[PDB]
């Protein structure tokens, strides 16, 4: 996993190992990459994309924090007009005087503690580091990096953008953090580890305006 | 950027081969099966297939 432990806290270590058992970090990263690729496939025609390619990421790339590699590759069938690297939430972005055919997407998961839980800054720094990095191999100089802080469940991306990519990524990330099975399993495991649960709103006791459902196909009993 | 301007209706769903919406836990189990390239045992296979045709018989009536 990508967790870094400052000092030996054996109890926390065993708890985190229990939570993340069974390659959960890898499963989450792979599921997120696949979901994003599926959304790109859905909106290919609107985005004038040629194809979506699942770049053969290294198996340990999910927690290879020192370096990185490309995750998704959008082939255009045309030269898009790309933007200067600006935060995903930056509504106002200017156009970079360049055009590209291949556009790469990178996904970076982090385990943010209290000190360094700023997804915006972390994604900015990691993009501006990997892009210039000599050991980081990317198909094209132009692309985007999306960072997900698991601990605080935050999301933000920084790199270049082409028309439509910004709204697409925004809504895709929102529906992701809402309804991704991998993150759901992570949240449930964290809840179980903390032994903290949520209550329920009793039951709509059958009323004179609700009794009509009594004779539906469902078999009902009155005690 | 001179972006296009529109609303992307991004919908992410997990479904089985029968077109039924998949529960998150079962979806994760299938993800893990495909990830590790291996499956369950004979008894669990029998149990799950028996549950499948049990629900089929229950709903057919």
């Amino acid at each position: 996993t990508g967790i870094f432990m400052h000092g030996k806290i054996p109890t926390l270590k065993i708890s985190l190992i229990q939570i993340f058992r069974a390659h959960l970090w890898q499963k989450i990263h792979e599921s997120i990459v696949m979901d994003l690729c599926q959304v790109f496939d859905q909106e290919l025609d609107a985005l004038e994309i040629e194809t979506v390619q699942k770049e053969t990421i290294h198996p340990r790339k999910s927690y290879k924090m020192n370096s990185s590699c490309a995750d998704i590759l959008l082939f255009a069938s045309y030269k898009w007009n790309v933007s200067r690297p600006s935060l995903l939430a930056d509504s106002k972005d200017v156009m970079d005087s360049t055009t590209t055919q291949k556009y790469w997407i990178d996904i970076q998961l982090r385990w943010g503690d209290y000190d360094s839980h700023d997804i915006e800054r972390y994604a900015r720094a990691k993009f501006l580091d990997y892009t210039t990095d000599n050991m980081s191999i990317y198909p094209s100089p132009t692309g985007v990096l999306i960072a997900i802080d698991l601990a605080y469940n935050l999301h933000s991306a920084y790199g270049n953008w082409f028309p439509g990519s910004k709204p697409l990524i925004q809504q895709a990330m929102a529906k992701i953090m809402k309804a991704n099975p991998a993150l759901y399993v992570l949240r449930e495991r964290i809840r179980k580890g903390l032994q903290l649960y949520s209550s329920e709103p009793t039951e709509p006791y059958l009323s004179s305006q609700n009794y009509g459902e009594l004779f539906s196909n469902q078999i009902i009993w009155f005690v | 950027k001179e972006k296009d301007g529109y609303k992307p209706d991004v919908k992410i769903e997990y479904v089985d081969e029968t077109g039924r919406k998949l529960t998150p836990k079962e979806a994760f189990r299938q993800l893990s099966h495909r990830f590790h390239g291996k499956g369950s045992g004979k008894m669990k296979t029998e149990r799950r297939m028996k549950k499948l045709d049990e629900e089929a018989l229950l709903k057919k009536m």
Partner: peptide, 21 residues
């Protein structure tokens, strides 16, 4: 529609350290 998420193998591959497609 939705496609089974095409995954890969980590251990006991008997192949090169790098990835297949």
């Amino acid at each position: 529609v939705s496609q089974k998420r095409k995954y890969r193998q980590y251990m006991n591959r008997k192949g090169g350290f790098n990835r297949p497609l």
